[PDB]
Design an enzyme around this catalytic site. Structure first.
Site, PDB file in Angstrom:
ATOM      1  N   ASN A   1       0.528   1.378  -2.179  1.00  0.00           N
ATOM      2  CA  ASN A   1       0.624   2.124  -0.927  1.00  0.00           C
ATOM      3  C   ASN A   1      -0.732   2.123  -0.268  1.00  0.00           C
ATOM      4  O   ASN A   1      -1.628   2.894  -0.651  1.00  0.00           O
ATOM      5  CB  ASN A   1       1.097   3.538  -1.198  1.00  0.00           C
ATOM      6  CG  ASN A   1       1.210   4.345   0.054  1.00  0.00           C
ATOM      7  OD1 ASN A   1       1.062   3.838   1.166  1.00  0.00           O
ATOM      8  ND2 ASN A   1       1.447   5.627  -0.106  1.00  0.00           N
TER       9      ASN A   1
ATOM     10  N   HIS B   1       7.111  10.562   1.083  1.00  0.00           N
ATOM     11  CA  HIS B   1       5.799  10.724   0.527  1.00  0.00           C
ATOM     12  C   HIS B   1       5.268  12.115   0.843  1.00  0.00           C
ATOM     13  O   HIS B   1       5.513  12.670   1.906  1.00  0.00           O
ATOM     14  CB  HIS B   1       4.870   9.675   1.125  1.00  0.00           C
ATOM     15  CG  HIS B   1       3.587   9.581   0.390  1.00  0.00           C
ATOM     16  ND1 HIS B   1       2.509  10.411   0.635  1.00  0.00           N
ATOM     17  CD2 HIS B   1       3.240   8.781  -0.632  1.00  0.00           C
ATOM     18  CE1 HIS B   1       1.545  10.098  -0.205  1.00  0.00           C
ATOM     19  NE2 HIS B   1       1.970   9.138  -1.002  1.00  0.00           N
TER      20      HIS B   1
ATOM     21  N   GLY C   1      -4.868  11.293  -4.768  1.00  0.00           N
ATOM     22  CA  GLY C   1      -6.159  11.136  -4.128  1.00  0.00           C
ATOM     23  C   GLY C   1      -7.273  12.000  -4.675  1.00  0.00           C
ATOM     24  O   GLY C   1      -8.384  11.951  -4.141  1.00  0.00           O
TER      25      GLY C   1
ATOM     26  N   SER D   1      -3.604   9.144  -8.649  1.00  0.00           N
ATOM     27  CA  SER D   1      -4.863   8.782  -9.297  1.00  0.00           C
ATOM     28  C   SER D   1      -4.716   7.773 -10.420  1.00  0.00           C
ATOM     29  O   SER D   1      -5.552   7.754 -11.334  1.00  0.00           O
ATOM     30  CB  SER D   1      -5.660  10.014  -9.726  1.00  0.00           C
ATOM     31  OG  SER D   1      -5.954  10.809  -8.590  1.00  0.00           O
TER      32      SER D   1
ATOM     33  N   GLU E   1       5.088  11.973  -8.117  1.00  0.00           N
ATOM     34  CA  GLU E   1       3.674  12.061  -7.778  1.00  0.00           C
ATOM     35  C   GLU E   1       3.327  13.536  -7.669  1.00  0.00           C
ATOM     36  O   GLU E   1       3.565  14.153  -6.625  1.00  0.00           O
ATOM     37  CB  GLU E   1       3.367  11.346  -6.474  1.00  0.00           C
ATOM     38  CG  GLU E   1       3.895   9.920  -6.429  1.00  0.00           C
ATOM     39  CD  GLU E   1       3.208   9.099  -5.397  1.00  0.00           C
ATOM     40  OE1 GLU E   1       2.431   8.186  -5.767  1.00  0.00           O
ATOM     41  OE2 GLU E   1       3.444   9.326  -4.183  1.00  0.00           O
TER      42      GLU E   1
ATOM     43  N   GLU F   1       2.444  13.150   1.788  1.00  0.00           N
ATOM     44  CA  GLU F   1       1.722  13.289   3.045  1.00  0.00           C
ATOM     45  C   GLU F   1       2.671  13.517   4.205  1.00  0.00           C
ATOM     46  O   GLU F   1       2.321  14.241   5.132  1.00  0.00           O
ATOM     47  CB  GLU F   1       0.780  12.106   3.278  1.00  0.00           C
ATOM     48  CG  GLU F   1      -0.353  12.114   2.245  1.00  0.00           C
ATOM     49  CD  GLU F   1      -0.925  10.769   1.860  1.00  0.00           C
ATOM     50  OE1 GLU F   1      -1.691  10.741   0.868  1.00  0.00           O
ATOM     51  OE2 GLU F   1      -0.609   9.731   2.522  1.00  0.00           O
TER      52      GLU F   1
ATOM     53  N   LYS G   1      -1.511   3.147   2.567  1.00  0.00           N
ATOM     54  CA  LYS G   1      -1.638   4.276   3.483  1.00  0.00           C
ATOM     55  C   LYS G   1      -2.168   3.780   4.816  1.00  0.00           C
ATOM     56  O   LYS G   1      -1.828   2.673   5.249  1.00  0.00           O
ATOM     57  CB  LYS G   1      -2.411   5.434   2.877  1.00  0.00           C
ATOM     58  CG  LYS G   1      -1.831   5.838   1.546  1.00  0.00           C
ATOM     59  CD  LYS G   1      -2.466   7.101   0.986  1.00  0.00           C
ATOM     60  CE  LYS G   1      -1.800   7.455  -0.336  1.00  0.00           C
ATOM     61  NZ  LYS G   1      -2.330   8.719  -0.877  1.00  0.00           N
TER      62      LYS G   1
END
Length: 249
Positions: A10, A94, A172, A212, A166, A96, A12
């Site tokens: 991904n 996702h 991140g 991560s 996740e 985000e 992003k």
């Protein structure tokens, strides 16, 4: 035995033409000798470039999001538009997008259902926040998110679904889940699928871990029996993604 693993990148909202050309060359020159589906998810504007340059036969291209229908939705990209350009994988839900862009469980479930109807392979993202984990709500949260998706699918649609667990606190941040933490959740999910959807579906379902992952922790995660690969953010922009792929042997 385990189903076919997935190693998914991904990217992003990152990349330039020059950096992508270099990274795709690295991926093309890495010979992959085992059975794995590699996925790269560039930004929308970089999809044509990656289609032109990526030649490694183990890879497919995915979008990072989509809406279900074409029409009067300024700024968005629809599933029919993606199919027409040759993209038939999508990441949906996702963290985000759930956090910044208002995607609720019902919005995600609707998108997943529509993608499956239109013939996509879908990577559907679920996971708990740090507050939910410390409140001992992890199981309730991830099973709620999964059951919302499942409510809009038929059994046959599950052949097109990949789940990505996740934990939001791992995305991140550098704070990867331990193999035991990830395995506990993956096992809980696979059991829920087995009881609520079917044991045949559960045995074939890929459940990926993300948050991560790097080339040094990937092999110890993959050693766990219910982890089927990875959804990788930051480390997928680097040449060490090659070793993340090879950790799924």
């Amino acid at each position: 035995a385990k189903p076919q693993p997935i190693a998914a990148a991904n990217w992003k909202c990152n990349g330039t033409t020059a950096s992508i050309e270099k990274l795709v060359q690295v991926f093309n020159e890495h010979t992959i000798s085992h059975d794995v589906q590699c996925v790269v998810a560039p930004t929308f504007v970089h999809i044509p470039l990656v289609q032109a340059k990526l030649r490694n036969p183990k890879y497919v291209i995915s979008a990072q999001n989509a809406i279900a229908k074409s029409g009067a939705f300024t700024g968005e990209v629809s599933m029919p538009i993606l199919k027409d350009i040759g993209v038939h994988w999508v990441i949906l839900g996702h963290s985000e997008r759930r956090t910044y862009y208002g995607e609720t469980d019902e919005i995600v479930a609707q998108k997943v259902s529509e993608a499956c109807k239109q013939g996509f392979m879908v990577i559907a993202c679920i996971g708990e926040t740090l507050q939910q984990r410390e409140a001992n709500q992890t199981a309730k949260v991830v099973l709620s998110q999964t059951s919302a998706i499942a409510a809009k699918l038929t059994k046959d649609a599950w052949n097109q679904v990949v789940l990505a667990y996740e934990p939001v606190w791992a995305i991140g941040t550098g704070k990867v889940a331990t193999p035991e933490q990830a395995q506990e959740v993956h096992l809980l999910l696979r059991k829920w699928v087995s009881e609520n959807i079917g044991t045949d579906v559960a045995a074939k379902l890929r459940i990926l871990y993300g948050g991560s992952v790097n080339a040094a922790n990937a092999a110890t995660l993959y050693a766990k029996p219910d982890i089927n690969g990875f959804l990788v953010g930051g480390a997928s922009l680097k040449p060490e993604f090659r070793d993340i792929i090879d950790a799924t042997r």
